[PDB]
């Protein structure tokens, strides 16, 4: 749903740009917050083991 | 068309469509995988190309790594006047 | 289509209709359900509407096999023409 | 006289039936439910006496049953009574319908009885003993057990098809007739679901008679799983085999195999110890032919010029259908003759055609 | 007619009794409260959703609270994530009664799992199968290793750790499929009461894409949920084995469905607890990536021993039948070549009709000899 | 009632009461997917006329079975539940089927064959019952499979694994029509000029009972068919149709139409609702151009 | 409702070929969480079991053995002995191998199993009770032998008194019986079609047989006395 | 398989998804198993047959095409063997390095079996190279399988320590 608004209070024209996560009053369609792009889907099934610790002594010869 | 029209307004514009075999190409059995989506999309360009829509100041670069992977009708003039080899 | 009848006489042309040619042949979920209706519509509207012709359905085809005889039904798509000729 | 007393008896039964105090209490239990209420589909279950649901509009709300009727009466992914408030499960809701499975002849104790089909009996024992016998279930008890299914051969419409329902009629279980060519699709994996849907029914409606006709196509192992060879061939069959080699019965759900392409099939597709039975229809010998002859010949009206032996000996060893078939066009000739009593000539004609 | 109608006369009055009867205690008890209590009780629960207009769950609509709404929509209406910072709600994020992440995870937990899965498991699992010793007759050599592969590690995991090892993490079964084969898996499954997942590769390739992938995950998901569970595949040949049919190009996903199965089963899955077991006709068809150790370790036939195994197996089977105690199963077993712990029922099971044709309680030698002949000749395959 | 009710039923629902306000006309119902049903189509058999020996045979194999089956029950047979026609192709061969089917008062069905066995599993399949299903509903109903029969107006020349799989898909249905059903004057018309492409078990009785076969025509048939289609279009005398049909050769009943159309197309281009013979005489070529063309 | 919970308990007895609901309803009744059902239905199944008992719950009793109760188990052992007494396997299949797989987890279980497996092999494992018989008339001798055992046979169970209650059913308890008798008619050689087991001499075992040979009045299942075709005539 | 989806270009989206949030966590090594999953474009204009696995590759290629200098993005793709080739599949800034994983040599296996034999209780009847010699081209876990089996064996032998014979018997457990 497309609304015009005079650019709301909590946001910055640089924060502002197309394709973004933003807090918006759902009712008022008043943008509350800019939102960081974070839960833009990690397809959470995507498996990130963060830098697990494994040696090269793990399987030799290679 | 936003890609057309924005460019059509913002022309000169270069339109470069990456390696277009998912949204390009002649498809398969030409059955429906949602291929009917592709054909449309495949045709949407065709419509802008074999249709009266020109490249006013906005031009279109087609991209493929293999050419033979494309709709024969796509290769046609009125759509493509150049098949760009890179030996 | 009606607007053409509202504008009668007029023309209906369709670029390479085949995009909508074959409907859900199967349970095709999204976007294939309407190509049913849209076709069925056109079918309904070809197959269901008068012959007093102020407007002529016209459709380009490179590849006609995506289509079905419901378009090729007589009274509706009567006249095939083929872009080629040695 | 007693018919009156019988009728009112039937009537008084209707009254008490409708009489379902408790009525108020039942209405109290309805007056619970409120109305009108909302359809919605199940998803999963927990003991919670709260569970959430599935909707076309797709609200999914975590909701209790109104509890007299039961969760366990139902399965996940099934339409349930829901309020319009929280879509509260009001109770057990069918979600009856499910009137579809892949391609089948849906029939039970079918028309064909072994009497009907012309005497084939020599192999009827095969199908009888393997199936009809445990269908009585009495002797099979001591017998300690019964094969899975049989394998027809010979010609359909006489041997294969006629026999098929003979015992299917006789045992009066749910006869499920299909062709593999009535499967596929050329696509991969619902060929199994086709079977599954069938086997869903097969599992569900037991007792049943599974039938299968002409596996020319879904059944051929070829030599290869690659190089153009359509997976779905085996891909189907294997699953058909899984439910086949995953089940034999003591006389409940019985299977039938009808086709001419035999070793197109896996040995475990038969899996002896399970499928012990090859039916093969032959050309009925003159007597056995005469056996079928007298049946269909006589049930055809005719003139006494006709004789069985007049027909019998004149024959090339026809199919038991050609009996029927000769008999068939035979009258058609008499119809072209526009007569109700057929001569002997039409028979020779109709046969030497067909 | 008349006298029968007397029975018919008795029929009417008898039915009228209950009709008369049923009305009686009907007067007594006068059913709102079974539910209207629970109803109004759970009407709170209802309303407990109904504020803010609100184990798969699929979608939580916990709706429109703005200060706050504390929910995920995974759905084409108003997709939602509570997170970005520390974002919870004390017991429950919010509402629907639904409270939680839908399925698709956003932060953690949050409100304990609202989750998990759509399409249930379209695959379905029987735990503690109807087979413990069921087809275990004659099946020893296999199970002998299976018990090692499956039973003992389920029994005493410690030993392998005491050793410093695990059980064979994956195992192959081949020969006539499922014949006792799956059931034999089901056997030790119910022998050990571990969770026995019967998943057929038939289930894996369906009308769509990521199909078994989706499954295999949910599989591998509820694998770990059902931990100490037997993932069992009959028809590894369904998805196929190693192949170049990616050279054709349509098979790719089907191939990947294996690679799916291949990939995920490899790295993180405990196979000392979560058992993985494969059943085929053709072990020759394997994608070697399957045959890889730490994926498939043990490899076993179903199988078809000797004269001797069959006898017992026969002896095992025929105990169902009334059987002549003079005649020897050894006698019968001598005659037949080696054949399946299924087929060996054709030995016994067919003779029942022999026993009924011969009208014996106890089938004679020839009854089985014929059966041996009859069946084996009746093969011609 | 609850009983007066039916599913799908168009009804006034009390909007916010969500109870029936009243009932409307339910709307229904054929379908698509290439199994669709045109219900008792119209043509009259005289219009390909001259074939009537076939037609009579057809009537004998269909109409008389349809019109009075019990004559054959009186005879005590199982009358044809499906029919064959074999011979010259393309007269408007459909007319042969429709006109009878019209005459019979039976839903006359067309189905694209290979759309009963596809890649995608079960939908080509599920159609099979539903086909068979509606078939019995509006029975007596004549079925005709498109894309199979070689009689030549509907001819695709079948298929080897495609519609052999379909006709078998029909054959058990045929056998299903031989099943507990035994519902007759439901006639699947497989009227075709090449059987070998198909399992001759289709010829087995109960499926194709009375096996009848078409036969090519000629000038006279054309002249007739001509005088039938020329009949249709608006004309002018001085016109011998035979001569045209004489000029016609290697032509068929459908092909005749095109001749007529062109005659008008000429005349229309001549600005005539009045057609001479000369025009037809040209269309002969123009069609026999096409007849000789591809 | 307390002994309304006993309501269909006496119904099991009745009962006729239906009996039909019992074997089908019994499974539902017994499952009712009230132990007075879970006590009684296992008992009530008995004449049903020799006239129409459950085919599925036979295993379910094993499941519910310890479910809410060990007396259910004490019944589930005992009850299987009951229904499995002299009626064995076949219709009763799921019940008895569980007794054959019932031995002892408890000396009372062992007691009850010894009871039950005694009951299992009661009558050498071949017995059946149908008070009515194929003489087209019901028997109220045994009918009196039964609800007697309902208030009784409670030695383990509710309404409990004492152990001697066990045999009050014997007033009708019959073997699995085909009584096949000759044209003179005190016991002598005579024979039938096949049983399981052979041509049955005077009173030799089977149940519910429709044979080749003719009875005297109204040939039937069960007891049939044997006259033979004057040409082919025999004691048999 | 996740990149393999029903939604059209879902994978590409996923790939983009995979791309971006990883670019946050970048420096990142993105591991890919059996690329040939998504590694076949076929030959043709029938490529919509799998547009997913293809375009996802193409999308990936484009992602691999989108940058050069980011070592923050590291892209690691394993196959048994690759199917189609690309100078995207070999490129600076795209997949640069075609990296063989040869089934190891025996001392290398003796080297790997070492690591597997490592955590095992052992009496050192062991000689690795022997085992290593008797073994052929085991990717590590077959040694580990031997390691595994030898243990179960060693228990069946009663042995707390695992011995050479035990391992021999792991080998003896049919390695083919």
UniProtKB/Swiss-Prot annotation, chain C:
The record's subcellular location field reads: Cytoplasm; Nucleus
Cross-link annotation Glycyl lysine isopeptide (Lys-Gly) (interchain with G-Cter in ubiquitin), location: 23
Q: Which residues form a coiled coil?
A: none
**What does the record say about PTM?**
N-acetylated by NAT3.
Instruction: State the family it belongs to.
Output: Belongs to the AAA ATPase family.
Give the protein's biological function: The 26S proteasome is involved in the ATP-dependent degradation of ubiquitinated proteins. The regulatory (or ATPase) complex confers ATP dependency and substrate specificity to the 26S complex.
- What is the name of the protein in this document? 26S proteasome regulatory subunit 6B homolog
This protein's species is Saccharomyces cerevisiae (strain ATCC 204508 / S288c)
Curated annotation (Swiss-Prot), chain E:
Q: Summarize subunit and interaction data from the UniProt record for this chain.
A: Interacts with UBR1 and CIC1.
Task: List Phosphoserine occurrences by residue.
Answer: 89, 156
Q: Which organism is it from?
A: Saccharomyces cerevisiae (strain ATCC 204508 / S288c)
Q: Which gene encodes it?
A: RPT1
Per UniProt, ATP binds at: 175-182
Q: What is this protein called?
A: 26S proteasome regulatory subunit 7 homolog
Q: What else does the entry mention about this protein?
A: Present with 105 molecules/cell in log phase SD medium.
Can you say where in the cell this protein is located?
Cytoplasm; Nucleus
- Known InterPro entries for this protein? 26S_Proteasome_ATPase, AAA+_ATPase, AAA_lid_3, ATPase_AAA_core, ATPase_AAA_CS, NA-bd_OB-fold, P-loop_NTPase, PRS7-like_OB
Curated annotation (Swiss-Prot), chain F:
Which GO terms fall under biological process for this protein?
chromatin remodeling; nonfunctional rRNA decay; nucleotide-excision repair; positive regulation of RNA polymerase II transcription preinitiation complex assembly; positive regulation of transcription elongation by RNA polymerase II; proteasome regulatory particle assembly; proteasome-mediated ubiquitin-dependent protein catabolic process
Q: Which GO terms describe its molecular function?
A: ATP binding; ATP hydrolysis activity; proteasome-activating activity; protein domain specific binding; ubiquitin protein ligase binding
Q: Which UniProt keywords apply?
A: Acetylation, ATP-binding, Cytoplasm, Nucleotide-binding, Nucleus, Proteasome
List residues binding ATP: 87-94
One GO term of the cellular component aspect?
proteasome storage granule
Q: Does the keyword Nucleus apply?
A: yes
Tell me where it mainly resides. Answer: cytoplasm
Q: Where in the cell is it found?
A: Cytoplasm; Nucleus
The protein's superkingdom reads: Eukaryota
Q: How does it get modified post-translation? A: N-acetylated by NAT1.
How this chain assembles, per its entry, is: May form a homodimer or a heterodimer with a related family member. Interacts with OLA1, TMA17, and UBR1.
Regarding protein family, the annotation reads:
Belongs to the AAA ATPase family.
Q: What does this protein do?
A: The 26S proteasome is involved in the ATP-dependent degradation of ubiquitinated proteins. The regulatory (or ATPase) complex confers ATP dependency and substrate specificity to the 26S complex.
- Could you share any additional remarks the record makes about this protein? Present with 4700 molecules/cell in log phase SD medium.
Q: What is this protein called?
A: 26S proteasome regulatory subunit 8 homolog
The root-end lineage is: Eukaryota, Fungi, Dikarya, Ascomycota, Saccharomycotina
Parent-protein residues present: 103 to 396 of 405
Swiss-Prot record, chain H:
Query: Which protein are we looking at?
Result: 26S proteasome regulatory subunit 6A
Which organism is this entry from? Saccharomyces cerevisiae (strain ATCC 204508 / S288c) (Baker's yeast)
Q: Give any single GO term for biological process.
A: ubiquitin-dependent protein catabolic process
User: What is the role of this chain?
Assistant: The 26S proteasome is involved in the ATP-dependent degradation of ubiquitinated proteins. The regulatory (or ATPase) complex confers ATP dependency and substrate specificity to the 26S complex.
The keyword Glycosyltransferase appears for this protein: no
State the compartments where it is located: Cytoplasm; Nucleus
The molecular function GO annotations come to: ATP binding; ATP hydrolysis activity; proteasome-activating activity
- State the post-translational modifications: N-acetylated by NAT1.
Q: Please state the gene responsible for encoding this protein.
A: RPT5
Question: What keywords does the record list, in alphabetical order?
Answer: Acetylation, ATP-binding, Cytoplasm, Nucleotide-binding, Nucleus, Phosphoprotein, Proteasome
Q: Which family does it belong to?
A: Belongs to the AAA ATPase family.
Q: GO cellular component annotations, sorted alphabetically?
A: cytoplasm; nucleus; proteasome complex; proteasome regulatory particle, base subcomplex
């Amino acid at each position: 749903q497309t609304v015009f608004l005079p650019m709301v209070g909590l946001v910055d024209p640089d924060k502002l740009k197309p394709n973004d996560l933003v807090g918006v009053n759902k009712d008022s369609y008043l943008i509350l917050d800019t939102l960081p792009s974070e839960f833009d889907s990690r397809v959470k099934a995507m498996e990130v083991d963060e830098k697990p610790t494994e040696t090269y002594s793990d399987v030799g010869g290679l | 068309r936003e890609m057309f029209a924005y460019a059509k307004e913002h022309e000169p514009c270069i339109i470069f469509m990456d390696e277009v075999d998912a949204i390009g190409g002649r498809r398969f059995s030409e059955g429906t995988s949602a291929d009917r989506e592709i054909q449309r999309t495949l045709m949407e360009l065709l419509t802008q190309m074999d249709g009266f829509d020109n490249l006013g100041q906005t031009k279109i670069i087609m991209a493929t790594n293999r050419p033979d992977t494309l709709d024969p009708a796509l290769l046609r003039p009125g759509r493509l006047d150049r098949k760009v080899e890179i030996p | 289509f009606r607007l053409a009848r509202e504008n009668a006489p007029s023309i209906i042309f369709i670029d390479e209709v085949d995009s909508i040619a074959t409907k859900r042949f199967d349970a095709q979920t999204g976007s294939d359900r309407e190509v049913q209706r849209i076709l069925i519509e056109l079918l309904t509207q070809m197959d269901g509407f008068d012959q007093s012709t102020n407007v002529k359905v016209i459709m380009a085809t490179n590849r006609a096999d995506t289509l079905d005889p419901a378009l090729l039904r007589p009274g509706r798509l009567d006249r095939k023409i083929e872009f080629p000729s040695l | 006289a007693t018919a009156e007393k019988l009728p009112n008896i039937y009537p008084s039964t209707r009254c008490k039936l409708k009489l379902l105090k408790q009525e108020e209490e039942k209405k109290q239990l309805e007056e619970i439910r409120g109305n009108p209420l909302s359809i919605g589909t199940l998803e999963e279950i927990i003991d919670d006496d709260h569970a959430i649901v599935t909707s076309p509009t797709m609200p999914d709300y975590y909701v209790s049953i109104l509890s007299f009727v039961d969760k366990e009466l139902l399965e996940p992914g099934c339409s349930v009574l829901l309020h319009h408030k929280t879509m509260s499960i009001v109770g057990v809701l069918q979600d009856d319908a499910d009137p579809m499975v892949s391609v089948m002849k849906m029939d039970k104790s079918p028309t064909e009885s072994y009497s009907d089909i012309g005497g084939l009996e020599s192999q009827i024992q095969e199908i009888k003993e393997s199936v009809e016998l445990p269908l009585t279930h009495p002797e099979l008890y001591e017998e300690m057990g019964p094969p899975k299914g049989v394998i027809l051969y010979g010609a359909p419409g006489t041997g294969k098809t006629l026999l098929a329902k003979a015992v299917a009629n006789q045992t009066s279980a749910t006869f499920l007739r299909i062709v593999g060519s009535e499967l596929i699709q050329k696509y991969l994996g619902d060929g199994p679901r086709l079977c599954r849907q069938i086997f869903k029914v097969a599992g569900e409606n037991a007792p049943s008679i599974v039938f299968i006709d002409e596996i020319d196509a879904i059944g051929t192992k070829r030599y290869d799983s690659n190089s153009g060879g359509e997976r779905e061939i085996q891909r189907t069959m294997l699953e058909l085999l899984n439910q086949l080699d995953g089940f034999d019965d003591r006389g409940d759900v019985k299977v039938i195999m009808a086709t001419n392409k035999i070793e197109t099939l896996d040995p475990a597709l038969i899996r002896p110890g399970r499928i012990d039975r090859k039916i093969l229809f032959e050309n009925p010998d003159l007597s056995t032919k005469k056996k079928i002859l007298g049946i269909h010949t006589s049930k055809m009206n005719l003139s006494e010029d006709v004789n069985l032996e007049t027909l019998v000996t004149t024959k090339d060893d026809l199919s038991g259908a050609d009996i029927q078939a000769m008999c068939t066009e035979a009258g058609l000739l008499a119809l072209r003759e526009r007569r109700m009593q057929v001569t002997a000539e039409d028979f020779k004609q109709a046969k030497e055609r067909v | 007619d008349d006298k029968i109608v007397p029975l018919t006369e008795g029929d009417i009055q008898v039915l009228k009794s209950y009709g008369a009867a049923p009305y009686a205690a009907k007067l007594k008890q006068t059913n709102d409260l079974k539910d209207i209590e629970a109803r109004i009780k759970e009407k709170a629960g209802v309303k407990e959703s109904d504020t803010g207009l609100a184990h798969p769950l699929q979608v939580a609509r916990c709706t429109k609270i703005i200060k706050a709404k504390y929910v995920i929509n995974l759905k084409q209406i108003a997709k939602f994530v509570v997170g970005l910072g520390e974002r919870v709600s004390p017991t429950d994020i919010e509402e629907g009664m639904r409270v939680g992440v839908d399925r698709s995870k956003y932060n953690i937990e949050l409100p304990l799992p609202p989750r998990i899965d759509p399409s249930v498991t379209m695959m379905t699992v029987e735990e503690k199968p109807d087979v413990t010793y069921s087809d275990v007759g004659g099946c020893k050599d296999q199970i002998e290793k299976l018990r090692e592969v499956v039973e003992l590690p389920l029994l005493s995991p410690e030993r392998f750790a005491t050793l410093g090892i695990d059980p064979p993490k994956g195992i192959l079964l081949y020969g006539p499929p499922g014949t006792g084969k799956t059931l034999c898996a089901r056997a030790v499954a119910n022998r050990t009461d571990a969770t026995f997942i019967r998943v057929i590769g038939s289930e894996l390739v369906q009308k769509y894409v990521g199909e078994g992938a989706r499954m295999v995950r949910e599989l591998f998901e509820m694998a770990r949920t059902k931990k100490a569970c037997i993932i069992f595949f009959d028809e590894i040949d369904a998805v196929g084995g190693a192949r170049f049919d990616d050279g054709a190009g349509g098979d790719n996903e089907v191939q990947r469905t294996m690679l799916e199965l291949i990939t995920q089963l490899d790295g993180f899955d405990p196979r000392g607890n979560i058992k993985v077991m494969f059943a085929t006709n053709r072990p020759n068809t394997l994608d070697p990536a399957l045959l890889r150790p730490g994926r498939i370790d043990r490899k076993v036939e179903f199988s078809l021993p000797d004269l001797e195994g069959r006898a017992n197996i026969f002896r095992i089977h025929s105990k169902s039948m009334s059987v002549e105690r003079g005649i020897r199963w050894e006698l019968i077993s001598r005659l037949c070549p080696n054949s399946t712990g299924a087929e060996l029922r054709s030995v016994c099971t067919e003779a029942g009709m022999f026993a009924i044709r011969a009208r014996r309680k106890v089938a004679t030698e020839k009854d089985f000899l014929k059966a041996v002949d009859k069946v084996i000749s009746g093969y011609k395959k | 009632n609850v009983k007066d009710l039916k599913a799908s039923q168009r009804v006034c629902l009390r909007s916010d009461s969500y109870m029936l306000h009243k009932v409307l006309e339910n709307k229904a119902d054929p379908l698509v997917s290439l199994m669709m049903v045109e219900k008792v189509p119209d043509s009259t058999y005289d219009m390909v006329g001259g074939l009537t020996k076939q037609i009579k045979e057809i009537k004998e194999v269909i109409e008389l079975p349809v019109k009075h089956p019990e004559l054959f029950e009186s005879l005590g047979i199982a009358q044809p539940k499906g029919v064959i026609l074999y011979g010259p192709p393309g007269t408007g061969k459909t007319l042969l089927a429709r006109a009878v089917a019209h005459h019979t008062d039976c839903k006359f069905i067309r189905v694209s064959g290979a759309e009963l066995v596809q890649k995608y599993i079960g939908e080509g399949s599920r159609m099979v019952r539903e086909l068979f299903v509606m078939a019995r509903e509006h029975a007596p109903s004549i079925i005709f499979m498109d894309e199979i029969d070689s009689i030549g107006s509907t001819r695709v020349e079948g298929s080897g694994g495609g519609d052999s799989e379909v006709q078998r898909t029909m054959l058990e249905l045929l056998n299903q029509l031989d099943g507990f059903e035994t519902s007759k004057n439901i006639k699947i018309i497989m009227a075709t000029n090449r059987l070998d492409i198909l399992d001759p078990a289709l010829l087995r009785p109960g499926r194709i009972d009375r096996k009848i076969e078409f036969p090519p025509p000629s000038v006279a048939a054309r002249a007739e068919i001509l005088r039938i289609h020329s009949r249709k279009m608006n004309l002018t005398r001085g016109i011998n149709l035979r001569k045209v049909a004489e000029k016609m050769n290697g032509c068929s009943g459908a092909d005749v139409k095109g001749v007529c159309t062109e005659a008008g197309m000429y005349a229309l281009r001549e600005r005539r609702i009045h057609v001479t013979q000369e025009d037809f005489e040209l269309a002969v070529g123009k069609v026999m151009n096409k007849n000789q063309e591809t | 409702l307390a002994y309304a919970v006993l309501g269909i308990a006496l119904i099991a007895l009745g009962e006729d070929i239906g009996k039909e609901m019992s074997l089908r309803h019994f499974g539902h009744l017994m499952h009712y969480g009230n132990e007075h059902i879970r006590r009684m239905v296992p008992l009530a199944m008995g004449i049903v079991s020799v006239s129409d008992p459950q085919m599925k719950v036979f295993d379910t009793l094993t499941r519910f053995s310890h479910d809410a109760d060990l007396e259910v188990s004490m019944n589930s052992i005992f009850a299987m002995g009951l229904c499995g007494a002299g009626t064995n396997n076949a219709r009763l299949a799921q019940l008895l191998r569980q007794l054959a797989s019932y031995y002892s987890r408890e000396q009372d279980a062992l007691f009850i199993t010894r009871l039950a497996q005694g009951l299992l092999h009661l009558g050498k494992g071949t017995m059946t009770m149908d008070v009515f018989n194929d003489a087209h008339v019901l028997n109220k001798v045994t009918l009196a032998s039964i609800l007697t055992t309902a208030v009784g046979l409670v030695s383990p169970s509710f309404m409990l008194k004492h152990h001697q209650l066990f045999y009050m059913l014997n007033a009708g308890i019959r073997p699995k019986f085909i009584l096949a008798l000759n044209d003179e008619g005190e016991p002598i050689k005579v024979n039938v079609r096949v049983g399981q087991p052979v041509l049955l001499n005077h009173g030799e075992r089977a149940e519910l047989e429709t044979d080749e040979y003719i009875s005297y009045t109204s040939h039937i299942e069960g007891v049939v006395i044997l006259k033979k075709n004057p040409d082919y005539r025999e004691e048999e | 398989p996740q990149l393999v989806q029903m939604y059209i270009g879902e994978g590409a989206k996923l790939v983009r998804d995979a791309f971006a949030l990883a670019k946050e966590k970048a420096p990142t090594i993105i591991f890919i198993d059996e690329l040939d999953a998504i590694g076949t474009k076929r030959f043709d204009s029938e490529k919509s047959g799998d547009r997913e696995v293809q375009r996802t590759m193409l999308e990936l290629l484009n992602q691999l095409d989108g940058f050069s200098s980011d070592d923050r993005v590291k892209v690691l793709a394993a196959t048994n063997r690759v199917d189609v080739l690309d100078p995207a599949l070999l490129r600076s800034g795209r997949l640069d390095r075609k990296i063989e994983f040869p089934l190891p040599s025996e001392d290398s296996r003796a080297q790997i079996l070492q690591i597997h034999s490592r955590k095992m209780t052992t009496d050192d009847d062991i000689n690795w190279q022997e085992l290593a010699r008797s073994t052929d081209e085991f990717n590590g876990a077959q040694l580990k399988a031997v390691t595994v089996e030898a243990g179960m064996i060693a228990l069946r032998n009663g042995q707390s320590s695992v011995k050479h014979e035990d391992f021999v018997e792991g080998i003896s457990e049919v390695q083919a």
